[PDB]
Amino acid sequence: LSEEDKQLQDELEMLVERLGEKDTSLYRPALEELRRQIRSSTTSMTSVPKPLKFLRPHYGKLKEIYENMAPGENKRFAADIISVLAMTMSGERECLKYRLVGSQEELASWGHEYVRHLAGEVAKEWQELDDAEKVQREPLLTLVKEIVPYNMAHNAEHEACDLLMEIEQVDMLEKDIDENAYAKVCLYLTSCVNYVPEPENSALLRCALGVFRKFSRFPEALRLALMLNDMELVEDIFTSCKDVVVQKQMAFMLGRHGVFLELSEDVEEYEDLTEIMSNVQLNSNFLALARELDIMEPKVPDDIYKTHLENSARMNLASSFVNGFVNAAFGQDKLLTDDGNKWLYKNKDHGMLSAAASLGMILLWDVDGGLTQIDKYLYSSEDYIKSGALLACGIVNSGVRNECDPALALLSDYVLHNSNTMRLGSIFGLGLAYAGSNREDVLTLLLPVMGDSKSSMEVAGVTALACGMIAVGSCNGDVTSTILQTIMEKSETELKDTYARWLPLGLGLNHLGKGEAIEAILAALEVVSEPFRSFANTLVDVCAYAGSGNVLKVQQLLHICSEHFDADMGAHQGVAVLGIALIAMGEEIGAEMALRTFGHLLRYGEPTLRRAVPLALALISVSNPRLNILDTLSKFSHDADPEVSYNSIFAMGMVGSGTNNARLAAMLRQLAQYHAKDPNNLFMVRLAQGLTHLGKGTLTLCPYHSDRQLMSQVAVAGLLTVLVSFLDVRNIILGKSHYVLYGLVAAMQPRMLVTFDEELRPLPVSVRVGQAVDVVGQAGKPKTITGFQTHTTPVLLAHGERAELATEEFLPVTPILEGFVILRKNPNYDL
Amino acid sequence: STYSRQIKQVEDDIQQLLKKINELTGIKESDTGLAPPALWDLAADKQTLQSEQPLQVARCTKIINADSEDPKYIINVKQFAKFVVDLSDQVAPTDIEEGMRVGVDRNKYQIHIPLPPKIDPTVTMMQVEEKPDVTYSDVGGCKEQIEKLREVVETPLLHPERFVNLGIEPPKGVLLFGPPGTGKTLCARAVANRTDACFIRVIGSELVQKYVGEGARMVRELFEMARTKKACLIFFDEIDAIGGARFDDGAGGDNEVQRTMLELINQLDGFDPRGNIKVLMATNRPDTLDPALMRPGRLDRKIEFSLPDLEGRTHIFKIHARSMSVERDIRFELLARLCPNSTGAEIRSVCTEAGMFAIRARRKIATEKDFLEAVNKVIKSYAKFSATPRYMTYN
Ligand SMILES: Nc1ncnc2c1ncn2[C@@H]1O[C@H](COP(=O)(O)OP(=O)(O)OP(=O)(O)O)[C@@H](O)[C@H]1O
Ligand SMILES: [Mg+2]
């Protein structure tokens, strides 16, 4: 028994005896001495007074002092000792109570651990309190308004965040944000938003947006509003800022995201801002990069096949697809930019459809120059060539918004053509050209095509895909109504055709990421016959919850996948398998968790169940060639089920799409050797080889940009089109409708880091590129990149690779160093 | 700390859930080489065990009456026996040749499947399957050397059409020589990274074997398995281990190693054509190599990796200090001038030691003074242990 411990044990009686005397003259000194005695051990975090823990029963003698008479000073320090003690046991409605009724002085005077426990209890009882107890939170608001600045004082900002999150009162947080902690609190709140459900999703999003707006951090505020898809808020953020350069960077971000604004002519620098937001300069910037990165030389599909190291109509069509994919958006090719008539006629039947359309891929984003090469094939007499060039028009115009619409002009006069092939090219090109535009003129021109009697089921599905791509995520009433009319007008036997599968997809594309706006749509779909009704319902529900991570919807999809059927009735199981990926793709933890579920689906599932797992893997890891998914797909590349093999090979191509991965190229070459005598598998292998070297390794199909926090709805729509069409790869892809692969054009973006001056000229700068590191939690300055290398700015960023300016000569306008970034000379540098 | 109890609760729940999942699915054993149960095609395994009979590996020795309709094949079943058998009905008579390995059944030993030639596993592992992480951009001051190497070992494989049209036979052998640390193996790694054909790395010390004639056997099998590919590259690092000049010292001085070198020479340029193999050897002692090995047709190109000049040393300094957190005004030209005859390895060590000097002083940026101290420590202080002055007499 320690002598000082024995003294504090004496205070359990002698000080209580001082509080046992009737007169109050001995009450104040003893109580004040006890209040300071608590702080005596509170000066050490690990040290706690064990004798007061024996004073817990002694509250019975002190029960009357803190309860039975005036609260001036007698109960004041008497209750605080009980509160400090209540930190030790459960403290249910106790540790809060005495601090609430007792002394109401500065909270941190009683310790950081004590106030942490008090805040936890505050949240716990705030959950308990009902509406009628609104007259019970008067002191609670004061406690939180004093706790939050205290937590921010000692770099415990994250602990502060939980407090207002639990009580659903994050609103006042913006009031107490200082300039030294706004970045950390905003980063933590944004990192939290991927897991909290509605309405706390939007609540947290708007609170962090307000914190950013208060500090004039316009680029990240615009990013955050884009995550909220609040067009009014996008407009408000864009026109609130007075800095022209910051507005230019924000315009670059909007153009990359596919969101466009109609500025007023009164706004200064309207011309250049509109050009930036319309991506008209994207082609020139990409070509300048390629010239700098000395990759302007065209690549023949032979250089990809590498048949000299290896110890037909389908072959030619696959080679044209490879030529289009490898040379995408480069404008030059040794095989079609030359006299391609011999090559183009080397293909037969619908191959001539894709091959000519492939000629539009090399001219991607180059509308002015691309149409100049389309025009020659626009006058071809053969039915396939003209419509292939028509679709190449839209492919060329895809991703760039031209003020004078060329694609609409060239494709309007062929959407009601008597030939179904000219139609087929025209709607698909129009959809690719105006994806994510919600243009009422284009939609009104396109919509009656679906209801036309001459329009075949293939044409109706193509029209649905297009109208969905124009109105992706817009919840367009007209498109929804006409798609419903087309769906319920068709006969039950007509719905057996897989092209009808595209009708819900466009409908699903209409409400992509909207969430709970499908209940009316689902009620409308209930009247549709089965098993098409289940397919349509699953498709639209998944598209509505795309990129949300809602575990409840994933549970529903897994319940759909659970009951297997001894094909015709089991079609929607593949859609559910794809939907697991479509929902889990939002955040990394969910995707890695869903990888195991995909493995289990491949293991226990039926053929139709396991024929879609490769598509789910491709969707969840597109342009992200992580070795686990690649090995999983390789294990099933030579699968007994032909459809599983085709889907696995195409998923291997999509996963490493644009990555130029050497290992994946070796695997694809080995598969080409193995599948030499199988035309379908060899065609899939050639497609995968073409995708793996997409844009000569300078393009990505990943729908997520801005540090994988912003979802590109157009990219999601294109990937969804291709992957859902791959649910019937035998009839659509390997059949006569391989042109649907050009939907990937909607998802093609350059993995870019181009630093511009304040006058938009290129500005080479030394930068560090390395794998992104999560910087949530750990305080101070933690490194956000590991295993990095120093390159000049015109460099391609792989998936998950962040870039930080190596020096401090330039300040970036936006924290996110992706795409086109404007740099400003640092005043502090060269001081 | 308020979430700690719930953190531990959910963590224990997750661990119990993972164990429960592993209970139904699998993931166990792993010492008997069992794949995860998701890959178990047990019905197909049983069907293979029944239908697919085992086949003993034998070697065909002689074909009697190959012309007629009853050709008999003498096979040597390894350590088992020797038999006179006939081909199965599912094998064409022209698919079996004398001296080739075949696979026969255990009942009548009829030849069932022609088999690839036997290759030593040590020879098989010598082929490179993971390309190195070095490109030609990581080699500075060797512009002419890299160009000469690429136009022999890479250009003919990449674009053979430019050579056949003009009746041009490109060189099929390159010897990289120079003092240690000059970049011979670095350039070889760059070649292996850029190459698309089969790349085989052979270290000369790996061709030294305990028994007589074994090294020549490994060389023969290396060139046999190199010929089973349309295009192939063999890298002979430190070829002076076995490539020494032949001599007669009374006793049997280096007779077996000389036989290995003679076998390599015979494979390179002998009675039989070598094939599409393009060999590549690197050594810091080219003066010790045999004159027959140093002859065109075996080593056609002799690329010298001499010490970098001032421009080359500046280029190497830029290469190795690219990712350095250096100051703004580092005079890399001055640093290159301060180490006249220095290999690229010394320059890399100078960069690393400058970084280490900056780190030791708890500084995040290395100044020019740090690079000067690094030059003093590496180029000057360590000059006692420099391999340069002794080895440029050999090159
Ligand atoms: N020309 C060069 N450019 C850049 N770095 C170089 C150059 N030469 C050497 N180095 C560096 O020095 C190291 C020396 O190792 P390397 O394998 O190139 O030596 P080497 O010439 O094969 O030597 P040895 O004869 O002892 O085998 C390389 O790994 C590289 O980091
Ligand atoms: Mg070496």
CA closest to B193 among chain A residues: A662
Nearest CB partner across the interface for A116, out of B1, B229, B328: B1
The reply, when asked if residue B54 is annotated as ligand binding, is no
What tokens does A669 get?
Answer: 């070459």
Residue A46 burial (CB count, 10 A): 6
Q: What is the dihedral of CA A742, A744, A750, A751, to 10 degrees?
A: -150
Phi first, then psi: give them for residue B352, nearest 5 degrees: -65, -40
Ligand 1 neighbourhood includes B345 CB (under 6 angstroms):
yes
The response to whether residue B127 sits with its C-beta less than 6 Å from ligand 1 reads no
For residues A283 and A701, give the distance between their C-alpha atoms in angstroms, rounded to a whole number: 17
Q: Compute the residue count for chain B.
A: 395
Contacts 24+ apart (CB under 8 A), A755-761: A755/A793, A755/A810, A755/A812, A755/A821, A755/A822, A755/A823, A756/A820, A756/A821, A756/A822, A756/A823, A757/A822, A757/A823, A758/A245, A758/A822, A758/A824, A760/A248, A760/A272, A760/A276, A760/A281, A760/A822
Q: CB contact, 8 Å: B229 with chain A? A: yes
For residue A432, the SS3 value is helix
Spatial distance between the Cα atoms of A355 and A343, rounded to a whole number of angstroms = 9
What does the block give as tokens for A100? 């609430």
User: Sheet holding B81-85: strands in order across?
Assistant: B81-85, B72-77, B56-64, B101-104, B111-114
Instruction: Report the largest interatomic distance among the alpha carbons of chain B, rounded to a whole angstrom.
Output: 91
Cα(B179) to centroid of ligand 1, in Å? Answer: 10
Structure tokens at B371: 């690079």
Beta bridge partners of B237: B203, B282
Q: Looking at residue B225, what DSSP letter applies?
A: H
Cα A465 to Cα A445: distance, rounded to the nearest angstrom = 15
Contacts of B228 in chain A (CB under 8 A): 311
Tell me the C-alpha distance between B392 and A226, whole Å.
65
Q: Give me the sheet containing A819-825, strands edge to edge.
A: A753-756, A819-825, A810-812
Spatial CB neighbours of B195, under 8 Å, sequence gap ≥ 6: B131, B153, B154, B157, B233
B345 strand-pairing partners: none
**Which residues face A770 on adjacent strands?**
A802
Asked if A119 and B230 come within 8 Å (Cβ–Cβ), the reply is no
SS3 of A238, please? helix
Q: Is A600 in contact with B322 (Cβ distance < 8 A)?
A: no
* Cβ of B203 below 6 Å from ligand 1: no
- Is B37 assigned to a binding site? no
C-alpha span between A144 and A137 (Å, rounded): 10
d(CA A273, CA A253): 11
In chain A, residues with a C-beta closer than 8 Å to the C-beta of B325 are 806
Q: In which element (H, E) is residue B341 found?
A: none
Cα dihedral B157, B160, B163, B168, rounded to 10, equals: 60
Q: Please tell me whether B178 is known to bind a ligand.
A: yes
> How far is residue B229's CA from residue B225's CA, in Å, rounded to a whole number?
7
DSSP state of A462: H
| Nearest chain B CA: its distance from A603 CA (Å) | 5
- Determine, for residues A600 and B25 on separate chains, whether the beta-carbon distance falls below 8 Å: yes
- Backbone dihedral angles phi then psi of residue A187, each to the nearest 5 degrees: -60, -45
CB within 8 Å: A788 and B328: no
Is residue A754 helix, strand or coil?
Answer: strand
Rounded-to-integer distance, Cα A416 and Cα A449, Å: 6
How many angstroms is it from B129 CA to the middle of ligand 2? Answer: 19
Inter-axis angle of helices A477-489 and A457-470, nearest 10:
160
Contact A637, A672 (CB under 8 A): no
Residues contacting residue A721 through CB under 8 Å, at least 6 positions apart: A465, A469, A502, A505, A509, A740, A743, A746
A640 DSSP β-pair partners: none
Q: Confirm or reject contact between B318 and chain A (CB < 8 A).
A: no
Q: How many angstroms away from the CA of B198 is the closest CA of chain A?
A: 9
Is B380 annotated in a binding site? The answer is no
Q: B275 exposed, middle or buried (CB, 10 Å; 0-12, 13-18, 19+)?
A: middle
Judged by its nearest atom, the ligand closest to the C-alpha of residue B189 is 1
Query: Hey, whose CA ends up nearest to atom 30 of ligand 1?
Result: B345
Tell whether B184 is in a known binding site.
yes
Are A503 and A481 in contact by the 8 Å Cβ rule? The answer is no
Does any ligand 1 atom lie closer than 6 A to the CB of residue B142? yes
The residue with tokens 């990394």 is: A588
CA distance A464 to A427: 9
Chain A nearest CA to B24, separation (Å): 11
Q: Is the beta carbon of B181 within 6 A of some atom in ligand 1?
A: yes
Selected for mutation to probe chain A from B135, B154, B196 (highest A CB count within 10 Å) is B196
Distance CA A233, CA A222 (A): 8
Q: Ligand 1 in contact with B316 (CB < 6 A)?
A: yes
Q: According to the annotation, is B270 in a ligand binding site?
A: no
Residue B141: C-alpha distances to residues B145, B253, B310, B315, B333 (Å): 9, 40, 9, 6, 13
> Which residues in chain B touch residue A599, judged by CB atoms under 8 angstroms apart?
38
Question: In the sheet that A766-772 helps form, which strands lie side by side, from edge to edge?
Answer: A785-792, A766-772, A801-805
DSSP letters, A396-430, are: HHTT---SS-HHHHHHHTTSS-SSHHHHHHHHHHH
Q: Which amino acid residue places its CA nearest to atom 15 of ligand 1?
A: B181
C-alpha closest to that of A287 among A279, A276, A298, A296: A296
Residue A308 burial by CB count (10 A; 0-12/13-18/19+): exposed, middle or buried? Answer: middle
Residue type, A822: I
The answer, yes or no, to whether any atom of ligand 1 lies below 6 A from the CB of B348, is yes
Rg (CA), chain B: 29
Best CA proximity match to A450, nearest among A478, A411, A408: A478
Residue B106's CB: how many other CB atoms inside 10 A?
11
CB-based contact B175:B286 (threshold 8 Å): yes
Helix axes B310-320, B344-360, angle to 10 degrees: 40
Rounded CA separation B227/A330 (Å): 39
- Sequence-ordered alpha helix ranges (H) in A564-678: 571-584, 588-604, 607-610, 613-620, 627-635, 642-655, 662-674
φ and ψ at residue A532, rounded to 5 degrees: -65, -30
| Contact (Cβ atoms closer than 8 angstroms) between residue A596 and residue A629 | no
A786 part of contact set with chain B, CB < 8 Å: no
For tokens 């990240």, the residue is A220
Query: What whole-number distance in Å separates Cα of residue A578 and Cα of residue A725?
Result: 12
Our CA dihedral for A767, A769, A772, A774, rounded to 10 degrees, sits at: -30
Q: Which residues of B359-385 are buried (b: 16+ CB within 10 A; e: fewer)?
A: eeeeeeebbbebbbbbbebbbeeeeee
Amino acid of residue A97: K
Determine the Cα–Cα distance for residues B65 and B71; give it in Å rounded to an integer. 5
Rounded distance, CA B191 to CA B214, Å? 29
Residue nearest to atom 2 of ligand 1 (CA): B139
Residues A433 and A541: their CA atoms lie apart, in Å, by: 26
Nearest CA in chain A to B35: A635
Residues in chain A: 831
HEC profile of B2-58: CCHHHHHHHHHHHHHHHHHHHHHHCCCCCCCCCCCHHHCCHHHHHHHHHHCCCCEEE
The reply to whether ligand 1 has any atom less than 6 angstroms from the CB of B286 is no
Residue A749 sits at φ, ψ, to 5 deg, of -130, 150
CA distance B156 to B231: 10
Report the interhelical angle of A218-227 vs A244-257 (nearest 10°). Answer: 20
DSSP alpha helix (H) spans, A656-704 = 662-674, 679-692
Helix axis angle for A477-489 and A440-451, nearest 10°, is: 10
Nearest to B370 by CA among B353, B384, B387, B385: B353
The whole-angstrom separation of Cα A753 and Cα A109 is 50
In sign, the C-alpha dihedral spanning B122, B123, B125, B126 is: positive
**B180 in contact with ligand 1, CB cutoff 6 A:** yes
Q: What is the 3-state secondary structure (H, E, C) of B99-151?
A: CCEEEECCCCCCEEEECCCCCCHHHHCCECCCCCCCCHHHCCCCHHHHHHHHH
DSSP B132-201: -S--GGG--S-HHHHHHHHHHHTHHHH-THHHHTTT-----EEEEE-STTSSHHHHHHHHHHH--SEEEE
Give distance in angstroms: CA of A732 to centre of ligand 2: 55
A532-554 exposure pattern, b = at least 16 Cβ within 10 A, e = fewer: bbbbbbbbbbbbbbbbbbbeebb
A414 vs A416: CA distance, rounded Å: 5
Looking at the DSSP bridge assignments, the partners of residue B303 are: B176
- The residue whose CB lies within 8 Å of the most ligand 1 atoms, and thus the one to mutate among B186, B287, B305, is B186
Q: Give the residue on B whose Cα is nearest the Cα of A307.
A: B230
Instruction: Note whether B135 contacts A: Cβ–Cβ < 8 A.
Output: no
B185 Cα to chain A: minimum distance (Å):
21
Q: What is the distance between the alpha carbons of residues A497 and A78, in angstroms, rounded to a whole number? A: 80
Closest by Cα among A621, A619, A652 to A721: A619
Q: How far apart are the first and last CA of chain A?
A: 64
Residue A819 pairs in a beta bridge with A753
Give the alpha-carbon dihedral of A314, A315, A316, A321, to 10 degrees: 90
Ligand 2 centroid to B155 CA: how many Å?
23
Strands A819-825 and B56-64: unpaired
Residue A559 CB-density burial (10 A; 0-12 exposed, 13-18 middle, 19+ buried): exposed
Q: Which residues of A699-728 are buried (b: 16+ CB within 10 A; e: fewer)?
A: bbbbbbbbebbbbbbbbbbbbbbbbbbbbb
Q: Could you tell me which of B127, B153, B144, B132 has the C-alpha nearest to residue B280?
A: B153
Q: Give the gap in angstroms from C-alpha B192 to the nearest C-alpha of chain A.
A: 12
* 68-107 in chain B: CB under 8 A from chain A: none
Tokens linked to A727 = 């649910």
Instruction: Give the closest-approach CA distance of A383 to chain B in angstroms.
Output: 37
Residue A530 makes CB contacts below 8 A (sequence gap 6+) with none
Distance from A604 to chain B by nearest Cα, in Å?
A: 8
Given the CA of residue B138, which atom of ligand 1 is nearest to it? 4
Look at residues A628, A509, A162 and name the one whose alpha carbon lies nearest to residue B6. A162
Which member of A311, A788, A789 has the closest CB to residue B228?
A: A311
Residue holding tokens 């157009």? Answer: A714
Measured CA to CA, the distance from residue A163 to residue A124 in angstroms comes to: 10
Residue B69 backbone phi and psi in degrees, to 5: -90, 0
Q: Which ligand is nearest to the CA of B184?
A: 1
Ligand 1 contacts CB of residue B132 (under 6 A):
no
Chain A residues whose CB is inside 8 A of the B229 CB are 309, 311
- Angle in degrees, 0-180, between the axes of helices A200-214 and A231-240, rounded to the nearest 10: 10
Breaks (C-N over 2.5 A) in chain A follow: 311, 566
Q: What single-letter DSSP state applies at residue B251? A: B
> Distance, CA B175 to ligand 2 centroid (Å)?
12
Report CA dihedral (A251, A254, A256, A259) to the nearest 10 degrees.
-140
Only one residue has tokens 């007994």, namely A640
Look up residue B95 and give its two tokens: 């698919």
Enumerate the β-bridge partners of residue B277.
B232
Residues 27-56 of B with CB under 8 A from A: 37-39
Instruction: Give the integer Cα–Cα distance in Å for A825 and A811.
Output: 6
Listed by the residue before each break, gaps in chain B with C–N over 2.5 Å are: none
Cβ A643 vs Cβ A607: under 8 Å: yes
- Look up residue B244 and give its DSSP letter: B
